[PDB]
Amino acid sequence: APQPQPVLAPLTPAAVFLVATIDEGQEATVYDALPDISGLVRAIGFRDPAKRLSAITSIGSDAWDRLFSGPRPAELHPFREIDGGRHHAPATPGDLLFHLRAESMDVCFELATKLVEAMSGAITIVDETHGFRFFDNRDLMGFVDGTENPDGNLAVVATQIGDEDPDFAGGCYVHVQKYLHDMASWNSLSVEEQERVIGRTKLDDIELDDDVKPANSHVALNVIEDEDGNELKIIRHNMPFGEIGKGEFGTYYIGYSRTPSVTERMLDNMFIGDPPGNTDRILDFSTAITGGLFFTPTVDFLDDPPPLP
Amino acid sequence: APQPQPVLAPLTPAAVFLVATIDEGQEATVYDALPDISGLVRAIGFRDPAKRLSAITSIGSDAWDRLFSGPRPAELHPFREIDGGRHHAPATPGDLLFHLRAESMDVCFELATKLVEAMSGAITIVDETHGFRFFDNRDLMGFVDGTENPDGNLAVVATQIGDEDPDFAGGCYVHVQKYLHDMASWNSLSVEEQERVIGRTKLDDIELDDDVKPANSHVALNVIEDEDGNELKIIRHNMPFGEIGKGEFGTYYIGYSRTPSVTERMLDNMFIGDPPGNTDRILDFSTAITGGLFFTPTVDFLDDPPPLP
Amino acid sequence: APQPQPVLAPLTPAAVFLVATIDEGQEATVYDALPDISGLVRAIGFRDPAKRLSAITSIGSDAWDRLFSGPRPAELHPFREIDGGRHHAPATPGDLLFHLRAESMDVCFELATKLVEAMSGAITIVDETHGFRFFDNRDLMGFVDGTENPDGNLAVVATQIGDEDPDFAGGCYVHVQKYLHDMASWNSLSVEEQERVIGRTKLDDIELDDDVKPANSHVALNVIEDEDGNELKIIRHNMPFGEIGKGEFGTYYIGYSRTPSVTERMLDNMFIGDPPGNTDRILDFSTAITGGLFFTPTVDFLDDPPPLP
Amino acid sequence: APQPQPVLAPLTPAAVFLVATIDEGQEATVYDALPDISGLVRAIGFRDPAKRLSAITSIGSDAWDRLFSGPRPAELHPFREIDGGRHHAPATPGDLLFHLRAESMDVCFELATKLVEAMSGAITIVDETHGFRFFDNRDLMGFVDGTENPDGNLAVVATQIGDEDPDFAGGCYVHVQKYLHDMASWNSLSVEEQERVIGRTKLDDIELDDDVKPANSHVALNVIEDEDGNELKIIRHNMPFGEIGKGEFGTYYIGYSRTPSVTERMLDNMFIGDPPGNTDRILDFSTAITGGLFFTPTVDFLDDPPPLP
Ligand code: HEM
Ligand code: HEM
Ligand code: HEM
Ligand code: HEM
């Protein structure tokens, strides 16, 4: 009966990520537009319903204490800035996240055009990226991106909250991280070295052998084993963006998870690293620019918001 | 026998316009990359040949006097800045124009990635727009854009130079104009007022009646009659762009023509206007930001450049 | 007025190559079916005309002296077996070549089913390959295959015979070579070594720098300069095939050209090699299995065959 | 008449590098042992004089301001820690450097045993490496190490100070850098990739062609041209060391030069890199652990030290 937000969707060829911060004293203006979002999605994306326009509304901690009364999600907190040994993961202020995805750029652009002008003057858009998609789902590093997202049962228990928090049954936690990795050192780097970085191959994306794969690789550090033996997986819709006029080539990481402890332990395996391997090899090239922790509610939660405190 | 550049191509769902100015003393570096462009196009766009990756290399006046010896195109000059009564059409310095077009954003992005890094350090990219495409070829104004481009004979004699300049048989002239029209006044404006602006309808794009269409409309001012009775047409691949994080909603106008006198008389009918109607009604909302006049050579001209002076 | 055979067609996702030798005393049986081929093509491929079923009938030297009277193509001869220093290019007997190409496998299969059973008992099919097509037009080596085929004027003068032989104005010469290259040594070989083999990159297929590209590379040896300065190009529809049950991974090379001297000089640059570089680096891995020289006539030539001698 | 320290010696099969820091208030204790060093060398190495035991005493900046009065070497300063884009060159505190070299390990060990116990309690040995020597002067990377050291006149003007500083006529400057490069990524890397790293071949150590050698290679970045056209060379006795019990495989770099500007420009060409090539390819695998800048005096300077301030 709790219908979740469309996070369990395939990767789309175009995507728009909006991190908009809410201005002071503009609470009821966003409280108007928050039930209107699914109406705008069904209004716009029904023009070409075979484009699969799907918005993912997400709300941070500050916007939760401002906008909503009653309960609170249990692990919803501001994104812990990870000041590691060499690489730092910053956290810019962002109240709400609009994650838009469809088959083409225009319908995402029009949904975002109608989104901020349903709450005109209430928000300033802090982060504006138009994430496109490479040839066979690659990123700017050249490796195929996101091939280990689960499906079915191993995905809905990976993302959707059950009754471990029954007031928010259904709903995820989001970690956006806008990277801006350089290509000057990455392109001069040889392929095999880059497979040491990633942990899988580049052309065919075969995972490397367990003894051949180094301990500080990305696919080596990001898989998390529990003590019972099961592995905890997240679903990430990482879409590359970039502007050649500034020479920017970045991959907008965005990870959906049942609890932010899993994503934060992955980020601890990357930035803080393992106690053997204290650095992740992709962070030698990728520097995070933005950061934020958010919460997806259900679409019923946007349909029936709790009253404004 | 002169093969022209692929200007006679249909409008593609994604486009990248690059206006890069050449740095001082970096002439031979661009002279290396200028024969390499068609090779890079055939190299990249053959991956998915049903995406129709097509670059249009264009060269301004300064880059012609720097890069090429021998002859000169007859009407190639810097873009005359039109300081009208109220609206001004500026002209930023830009040496060469890279016009890229294909079915998706990624292959245009990768061709542009390989374009500046075939001449690394020789250029600074002044203007960086990623032109996407609306639902049924619309622009951000809401009207269907570019429905009066000719086809066949009325297009090749509209764009390709014959032997009126036999040293450049085949080849066009380009007028880029990056507009940044506001949507706050345009959206509050009513539809029939906007059809007085355009001159055609909005939903179905029927051209209005000749008596009903006002004299200061866009479609009224831009059609040019000659004294023999024939009309001179240009081919324009106007692609909308925009950034909602700045609130920008612009249409990157780009017009290909056999001679820049035709495009300049259209711009005189818009900015300077008719002596009856001195203003074009779309310029009440559209303010030009950039501007430039360029020259398309043949692909044989890039294959066989004249020697560097 | 001479309509050529559909050789100037884009690469299709499926292809069937048939090298059938004609049995002794079965001349008039093939002489029946040879005007019927375009009728069968228009009959079958009109079911889904957006599959682009296109047959290329080709005739060798023996089938020309048997089947046709009157003139002879000037350079039509049996395929000269190249016994180089280490690699040998054999020539199995094959009278006629059926080159079939369309968007799917089934309509090529049905055209080939109707082709041999229009001349039932007259031929034995010596070589039977079902050439499929990789992701972005790649081959089994992993490199994008066939990205330097010309288009337009530089293709029709590359393939179609003018009036240098006016009795066969329009028409090409075909060099089939069924390779069976091993993947055990190629996969263990590193990427940059393979880019020394090919001469272009692997992921993005950028051609290498002229000083960086070695002299014994494939793209280095196969480009042919003339003494006037023009380069002679051929059009090749190389389609990969293979059978994993035998561990076969081969690329069916097939090259169309205006004269077989160009293709034979390319094969001399590969097998015999340059006098500096006597071996082509791809022939370290690719061993030719079959070989044949054929002639495409016009479709008018199949419509109006010369009388049977 | 100024006899220099034995820096102009061939590479020996065993070497001991000692970086010992002087304790506070133990100045006169080292001032006792500093004239005794050549006496200990002639005392121990005369047992088997065909082992060529040769110590190179070196003194840093802090030990110069503590131990010696009067003048100062002109460019003697603490080793500037190079915090590049990705690779950092640290500088641990080390007052004096004992560089020992002979045909076998034992006589170097005994000279070092008598060296610290001639100044017992005055020093703590910060860095203790026993540099052995590979098959044909190789290092752990597998390449032959140090084959471009000059000889004769081009070596004595490369190392020994003339009267550009006449108070220290004869004498060098030392840059020690204890690397700890990993072998897991280097061994999985292929040979030709490693020759792109080094710039010379691996088995026979032929220098590569000037166009074939990449710009970010080690031998490409470390050769320094002046504006007059002469090249500045240093002499380096790089000896490999290592401990397999920790999995350490390192090459103790130690470079002797007439002025530290040359060695520091080489380190700037490596870590900071060229403005085209900002990284040296061997620094992808080699991470510096220690670092220090020292000064070799003459042996007459140890025989006649200036009075203790
Ligand atoms: C710096 C930007 C990043 C890039 C370019 C990147 C790219 C990749 C690539 C290419 C793979 C291998 C293909 C696949 O399995 O997805 C991968 C794996 C993965 N990435 Fe990322 N990634 C980035 C950051 C992150 C972050 C910040 C997280 C989470 C905190 C993350 C989570 C994962 C996970 C969980 C895997 C799969 C591990 C396994 O297969 O179980 N990535 N990433
Ligand atoms: C300010 C940005 C502009 C916008 C949004 C715009 C949009 C449009 C639209 C919607 C139409 C009607 C549909 C069609 O016929 O194309 C049109 C017509 C046209 N536009 Fe534009 N346009 C712009 C600027 C220009 C400029 C700067 C030129 C040339 C100097 C130009 C040349 C034309 C021409 C020639 C026509 C067709 C007139 C006729 O049908 O013969 N436009 N434009
Ligand atoms: C052994 C099987 C072969 C394979 C796997 C193969 C594959 C390739 C590949 C990957 C390229 C680079 C991409 C492109 O430009 O096409 C290439 C180039 C080429 N191949 Fe082949 N090829 C083979 C045999 C041949 C043969 C037998 C000929 C002709 C006698 C030939 C003619 C060419 C030509 C003319 C080029 C382009 C050179 C230039 O760009 O001007 N190939 N081939
Ligand atoms: C990271 C550890 C290093 C290793 C394993 C290493 C090894 C090598 C090797 C194998 C060569 C080529 C053979 C020969 O010419 O010597 C070489 C060349 C050279 N190395 Fe190093 N090296 C290292 C660091 C350094 C450093 C830190 C410097 C000086 C700042 C340096 C200075 C040179 C010079 C000047 C050359 C010769 C360039 C030319 O031939 O003119 N090396 N090194």
Distance from CA of D286 to the nearest CA of C (A): 22
D78, D293 contact by CB (below 8 A): yes
The Cα A22–Cα A93 span in angstroms is 10
Interface of C with B (CB under 8 A): 10-11, 136-137, 144, 146-148, 152-154, 200, 204-207
**Torsions phi, psi for B265 (to 5 deg):** -75, -30
B176, B9 contact by CB (below 8 A): no
Residue in chain A closest to D282 (alpha carbons) equals: A189
Of A57, A78, A41, nearest to A4 by C-alpha is: A57
Beta strands at B14-22 and B123-132: parallel, antiparallel or unpaired: antiparallel
Q: Is the CB of C291 under 6 A from ligand 3?
A: no
Best of D83, D183, D185, D192 to disrupt the A interface (most A CBs within 10 Å) is D185
The Cα D74–Cα C99 span in angstroms is 80
Q: Measured between CB atoms, which of A136, A142, A192 is closest to C190?
A: A192
Dihedral sign (CA A130, A136, A137, A138):
negative
The Cα D82–Cα D77 span in angstroms is 14
CA of A147 to the centre of ligand 1 (A): 9
The Cα D168–Cα A223 span in angstroms is 60
Report which protein residue has its CA nearest ligand 2's atom 1. Answer: B286
Length of chain A: 309
A131, A249 contact by CB (below 8 A): no
First vs last C-alpha separation in chain C: 26
Q: Measured between CB atoms, which of A104, A125, A135 is closest to B245?
A: A125
Q: Residue C85 burial by CB count (10 A; 0-12/13-18/19+): exposed, middle or buried?
A: exposed
Other CB atoms within a 10 A radius of the CB of residue D306 amount to 12
Chains in contact with A via at least 3 Cβ–Cβ pairs below 8 Å: B, C, D
Q: Is the CB of C15 under 6 A from ligand 3?
A: no
Residue in chain C closest to D189 (alpha carbons) equals: C190
Of C256, C257, C288, C254, nearest to C270 by C-alpha is: C288
Give me the residue label for tokens 């002296």: C65
Q: Measured between CB atoms, which of D190, D211, D212 is closest to C193?
A: D190
Q: Which atom of ligand 2 is found nearest the CA of B231?
A: 41
Subunit contact A185:D216, Cβ cutoff 8 A: no
From the candidates D95, D145, D268, D280, give the one annotated as an active-site residue. D145
Q: Is the CB of D61 under 6 A from ligand 4?
A: no
Distance from CA of C114 to the nearest CA of B (A): 30
Give me the residue label for tokens 């390819």: D281
**How far from D155 is each of D73, D158, D172, CA to CA, in Å?**
20, 5, 12
Chains in contact with C via at least 3 Cβ–Cβ pairs below 8 Å: A, B, D
Q: Measured between CB atoms, which of A109, A125, A132 is closest to B105?
A: A132
A280 is catalytic: no
Give me the residue label for tokens 């002067």: D137
CA of C239 to the centre of ligand 4 (A): 48
Q: Is the CB of C286 under 6 A from ligand 3?
A: yes
CA of B219 to the centre of ligand 2 (A): 7
Subunit contact B46:C144, Cβ cutoff 8 A: yes
Contacts of A188 in chain D (CB under 8 A): 216, 277, 279, 281
Q: Which atom of ligand 3 is found nearest the CA of C286?
A: 1
Report which protein residue has its CA nearest ligand 3's atom 34. Answer: C222
B20, B98 contact by CB (below 8 A): yes
* Ligand number nearest to the C-alpha of B208: 2
Which residues lie below 8 Å from residue A116, measured CB to CB, with a gap of 6+? A18, A20, A123, A125, B244
Of C125, C234, C215, C132, nearest to C175 by C-alpha is: C234
Q: What is the DSSP string of B35-97?
A: THHHHHHHHHTTSSGGG--EEEEEE-HHHHHHH--S---TT------EE-SS-EE-----SEE
Give me the residues paired with residue A15 across strands: A101, A131
Give me the residues paired with residue D144 across strands: D138
**How far from C212 is each of C190, C193, D210, CA to CA, in Å?**
17, 12, 10
Chains in contact with D via at least 3 Cβ–Cβ pairs below 8 Å: A, C
Give me the residue label for tokens 């035709």: B262
Beta strands at A96-102 and A54-59: parallel, antiparallel or unpaired: antiparallel
Which residues lie below 8 Å from residue B70, measured CB to CB, with a gap of 6+? B167, B306, B307
Q: Which atom of ligand 1 is found nearest the CA of A148?
A: 15
Of C212, B25, C208, A192, nearest to D215 by C-alpha is: C212
Beta strands in B121-245 (DSSP E): 123-132, 173-178, 224-225, 231-232, 235-236, 239-243
Q: Is the CB of C268 under 6 A from ligand 3?
A: no
Q: Residue A170 burial by CB count (10 A; 0-12/13-18/19+): exposed, middle or buried?
A: buried
The 8-class DSSP code of residue A117 comes to: T
B73, B164 contact by CB (below 8 A): no
The Cα A278–Cα A272 span in angstroms is 6
Experimental method: cryo-EM
A234, A158 contact by CB (below 8 A): yes
Report which protein residue has its CA nearest ligand 2's atom 37. Answer: B219
